[PDB]
C-alpha cells in the first residue's frame, strides 16, 4: 500500500492510494484501498487522508472519512482526530497501521501504531522530512 | 502548500534491516516527495501531485504497488487504487486489475471519464483500454523479493 | 424491537399505476416486514432478522435484488449485497456475483468465514461454493418486466 | 436495491442490502450496495442504516456512515441526521434516493427525496406501516 495527500496553492486537497494487496491473499478479495472513506478521502472543507493497515479494520471503522467526520462534526483538530483513530479506535478493533492526512489549513499528520511507516512530507520550497521508525 | 506520501505501515524491523537498506527507502521517499514539492511550487493541482507521487510509488520496486506488487495465493498480482478530488468530491477506484501498469492512472480515468466511482477486474481494464491505456502482462510487477516472501508465508 | 425494509427509492408515478398493481407491492412488503416482526418478537437477533428480510426481498421478483434483478448493458445480471453486525461491527459484502441465488447469504458467509470484508466476481462465488452454497444459472433472476425495461432504456 | 435494518430484544442493531444494480449499467461497475458506509452501516452505539439511490453520490458522501457520524459526533437526532443527509447533502451532490435507519433507542426513519420509496416498518408484536408515495 502506497499513498499521497496534497494541498495546492489554490487550496485544493486531494488523496491517492495504490496497493498490490497482502502476500498470499485470497484472489478477488478487496481491502481498504479502492473504498472511498476507508483507504482514501479528500474534502476541500476538511481533510485529505490516505490510509495503510489491516483493510478489514480500516473498512469497518471507515478510517479516512472518520478523520474528516471527527474534525468537521466533533470539532477535533487534525492531530486530535489522528490520535482518536490511529492510537485508540483501530487498536481496539484489533487493527494495525497508519495514515497520512493534510487539512484545509495546511496542517500535516503521519500517525501509525505499527513498528514503522515509510513516509515523507514537506511544504513547497522547503526540504522534506522522511522517516521509517518511531 | 504541502505534500505527504507513504509506502506502507507495518512490522518494519530494524534488527533484520541494514543502514544501506534504510537509505534506499529514504532516498526513494525523499526523491518522490521532492518531485511533489516542486510540482506544488510550479502551481500544479493537488490531484496531479497525488497522482504523480502514487505513480512514482507504483514504478518503484521498493513499494507494494505497481512494480513490486505482492503475490496472491495463486502467484498472481491483483492491484487496487483510489483517488479523491477535494474540490468536486469526485473519486475513482480500480480493484483487482492485473493488466494496467499504473492503477492510480486508471482510477483517475474512472473518476474523470465515467459516472461511477469504482470498476473491477476486466471491466476496469476494458474501460481503460478503450481510452488508450496500454495492456501489460501481470509479469512486469513480479520481483524475487515479493516471490520469496510468498514462499515464506507458505 | 423493530424492523424497517425498503424495496428501492425512485421514480414511482401514481398516474402510471393502478390500485391492484400498488397492492401487490404493499402485500409483498407487509408479508416480509411481518416475518421480521415475528422473528424479533420471538427473540431472534437483528442480524438473522435483516438477513431473512433481505433474502425474502431477494426471492420476491417485484424487487431489484436476487430474483427480478435488472440486466446490465450485456444482458447479464450482476448482484451485490452487504451485511453489517452492530454488535461485533463485522461486515461482509459480495459485489458482481451471478451464480449465487441469494447474495445477502454469501455476504453473511464472507462476514463470518473470511478475514475479508468484500469479495468480487468468481472469487466471491468460489468462496461460497467451497462453503456449501449452491451454484445457480444467472437465468433464474431474469423476468420479462426487467427484460422489457432494459429494451426501453436501450 | 432492497434493504433491512432491525433492533432486537437484546438491543443489537444490524443492516443488510442487496441489488441487481442499474438497468443498462456498464458490467463490473460498483454502486453503493457492497461498500460499507455507503450502502450499509450498523453500530450498536449509534444506528443501523440501509441506503438506496445514486451509488456514485452515496459512495462519495458515505451516506450510511454519515448518518452514524452526525448522530455520534454532531449530537444530531436520527430524524435530524436523516434530513441533513437525504434532503440536503445528497441533492446538492446531484444524488436522488433514500435510506431506512434505526438508532439504539428504537427510533425509525425512512427518508427519501424521490417520488417513491417502497418501504415498511413495524415494532415486534405490532401492526406494520407500509408506504410507496411521499409522506
Ligand atoms: Na512499487
Ligand atoms: Na427480488
Numbering used by the authors:
A (entry chain BBB): 179 to 312
B (entry chain AAA), C (entry chain CCC): 4 to 157
D (entry chain DDD): 179 to 313
Authors' account:
l-Asparaginases hydrolyze l-asparagine to l-aspartic acid and ammonia. The prototypic class 2 enzyme is EcAIII from E. coli. EcAIII belongs to the Ntn-hydrolases, which are expressed as immature polypeptides that dimerize and then autocatalytically cleave themselves into α (∼20 kDa) and β (∼15 kDa) subunits to form the mature (αβ)2 heterotetramer (a dimer of two αβ heterodimers). The same Thr179 acts as the nucleophile in the autoproteolytic maturation and in l-asparagine hydrolysis.
Similar observations were made for variant RDM1-12 with Ala at positions 210 and 211. Asp210 and Ser211 could be substituted individually (variant RDM1-37, D210S mutation only) or simultaneously (variants RDM1-3, RDM1-8, RDM1-12, RDM1-18, RDM1-24, RDM1-29 and RDM1-38) without any loss of autocatalytic activity. Moreover, the type of substitution, i.e. polar to polar (RDM1-24), polar to non­polar (RDM1-12, RDM1-18 and RDM1-29) or polar to polar/nonpolar (mixed combination; RDM1-3, RDM1-8 and RDM1-38) also did not influence the ability to autocleave. Moreover, a multi-step denaturation process was observed for most of them. Analysis of T m of the autoprocessing mutants reveled that they can be divided into two groups: those with decreased (RDM1-3, RDM1-8, RDM1-29 and RDM1-37) and increased (RDM1-12, RDM1-18, RDM1-24 and RDM1-38) T m values.
